[PDB]
Design an enzyme around this catalytic site. Structure first.
Site, PDB file in Angstrom:
ATOM      1  N   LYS A  53       5.999  11.680   3.942  1.00 21.37           N
ATOM      2  CA  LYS A  53       6.028  10.278   4.295  1.00 21.37           C
ATOM      3  C   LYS A  53       4.535   9.877   4.133  1.00 21.37           C
ATOM      4  CE  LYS A  53       5.338   7.263   8.015  1.00 21.37           C
ATOM      5  NZ  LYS A  53       6.696   6.801   8.455  1.00 21.37           N
ATOM      6  N   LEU A  54       4.287   8.649   3.696  1.00 19.86           N
ATOM      7  CA  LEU A  54       2.922   8.177   3.497  1.00 19.86           C
ATOM      8  C   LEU A  54       2.884   6.673   3.654  1.00 19.86           C
ATOM      9  CD1 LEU A  54       0.813  10.310   2.528  1.00 19.86           C
ATOM     10  CD2 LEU A  54       0.365   8.775   0.586  1.00 19.86           C
ATOM     11  N   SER A  55       1.750   6.161   4.115  1.00 24.21           N
ATOM     12  CA  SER A  55       1.614   4.717   4.182  1.00 24.21           C
ATOM     13  C   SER A  55       1.724   4.182   2.759  1.00 24.21           C
ATOM     14  CB  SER A  55       0.239   4.321   4.730  1.00 24.21           C
ATOM     15  OG  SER A  55       0.082   4.754   6.067  1.00 24.21           O
ATOM     16  N   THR A 105      -1.132   1.099   5.916  1.00 24.08           N
ATOM     17  CA  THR A 105      -0.781  -0.206   5.408  1.00 24.08           C
ATOM     18  C   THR A 105      -1.258  -1.221   6.455  1.00 24.08           C
ATOM     19  OG1 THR A 105       1.131   0.683   4.271  1.00 24.08           O
ATOM     20  CG2 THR A 105       1.068  -1.710   4.614  1.00 24.08           C
ATOM     21  N   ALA A 106      -1.187  -0.865   7.738  1.00 25.62           N
ATOM     22  CA  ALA A 106      -1.674  -1.783   8.777  1.00 25.62           C
ATOM     23  C   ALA A 106      -3.135  -2.165   8.514  1.00 25.62           C
ATOM     24  CB  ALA A 106      -1.568  -1.136  10.166  1.00 25.62           C
ATOM     25  N   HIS A 143       3.830   1.766  15.276  1.00 28.84           N
ATOM     26  CA  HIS A 143       4.842   2.556  15.964  1.00 28.84           C
ATOM     27  C   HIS A 143       5.457   1.818  17.158  1.00 28.84           C
ATOM     28  CE1 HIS A 143       3.577   5.670  13.250  1.00 28.84           C
ATOM     29  NE2 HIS A 143       2.522   6.074  13.937  1.00 28.84           N
TER      30      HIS A 143
END
Ligand SMILES: [K+]
EC number: 4.1.99.29
Length: 270
Positions: A53-55, A105-106, A143
């Protein structure tokens, strides 16, 4: 077995529950490696894991090493990271903002939204207390923090997902599941189908994944766990779709326009 990295957050444990427990078929056995998302983001720069999983912002940095599966990700209109503070702020200019990782991404979205802040990089679970305690003036949260921030007396400065939607008319791509290219095309396609099956299985039997979600998010109440999966798992988790693809293309176009990522002729998805 192939090492598979993801976060211990309810959305990831929900999505991968079936695959990891043999409840859906997989082309190869998988060895889960649970880490903070920024740890996974840093690892991908080195191509450490074969599946991770990755941004989405970080994916733009590793396209020649990885390709994104169409399934298993987090995208949508109501999943955006928020910026919170102890009270209203006129602007983020000159203020310290605690952030969960420069490759997220944030962080990318916050950087599109404002450019005069001072980032303080920490694990995401330190952000709400740092803001409440006055160690920074605002916090970029991800989250489950979007559900609990009022417990710390805080207010929302901006919902970056809403801001992105207003700016682009598209959902926000937050996280993707990537396969390292050396795995071979056939296996990668089979893994995409397996992850889609895993998402579909949890959607059909959500209660079956509860023990696993609780085991990795021991600080969360069941109410928060259920709100978290309801918020972060949606149609885009089964397949990015036509709109999801357009949204990822727009996100990468914005990164390229700032020289944050290099263009590539390679398709974005498997
Ligand atoms: K709440």
């Amino acid at each position: 077995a192939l090492r598979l990295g993801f976060s211990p957050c309810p959305n990831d444990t929900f999505i991968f529950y079936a695959l990891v427990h043999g409840r859906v078929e997989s082309p190869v056995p998988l060895e889960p490696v649970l880490e903070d998302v920024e740890t996974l983001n840093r690892w991908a720069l080195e191509g450490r894991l074969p599946l991770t999983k990755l941004s989405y912002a970080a994916y733009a940095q590793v396209r020649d090493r990885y390709v994104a599966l169409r399934s298993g990700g987090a995208l949508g209109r109501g999943v955006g990271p928020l910026v919170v503070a102890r009270g209203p702020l006129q602007a983020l200019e000159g203020l310290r903002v605690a952030v969960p990782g420069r490759h997220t991404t944030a962080y990318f979205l916050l950087s599109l939204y404002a450019q005069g802040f001072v980032p303080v990089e920490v694990r995401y679970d330190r952000i709400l207390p740092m803001v409440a305690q006055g160690e920074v003036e605002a916090g970029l949260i991800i989250h489950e923090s979007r559900f609990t921030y009022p417990r710390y007396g805080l207010v929302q400065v901006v919902d970056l997902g809403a801001w992105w939607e207003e700016r682009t008319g598209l959902p926000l791509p937050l996280g993707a599941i990537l396969a390292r290219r050396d795995l071979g095309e056939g296996l990668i396609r089979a893994l995409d189908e397996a992850v889609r099956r895993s998402v579909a299985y949890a959607l059909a039997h959500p209660e079956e994944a509860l023990d696993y979600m609780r085991a990795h998010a021991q600080e969360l109440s069941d109410e928060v766990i259920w709100a978290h999966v309801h918020t972060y798992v949606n149609a885009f988790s089964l397949d990015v779709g036509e709109e999801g693809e357009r949204a990822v293309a727009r996100l990468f176009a914005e990164a390229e326009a700032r020289g944050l990522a290099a263009p590539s002729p390679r398709p974005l998805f498997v």
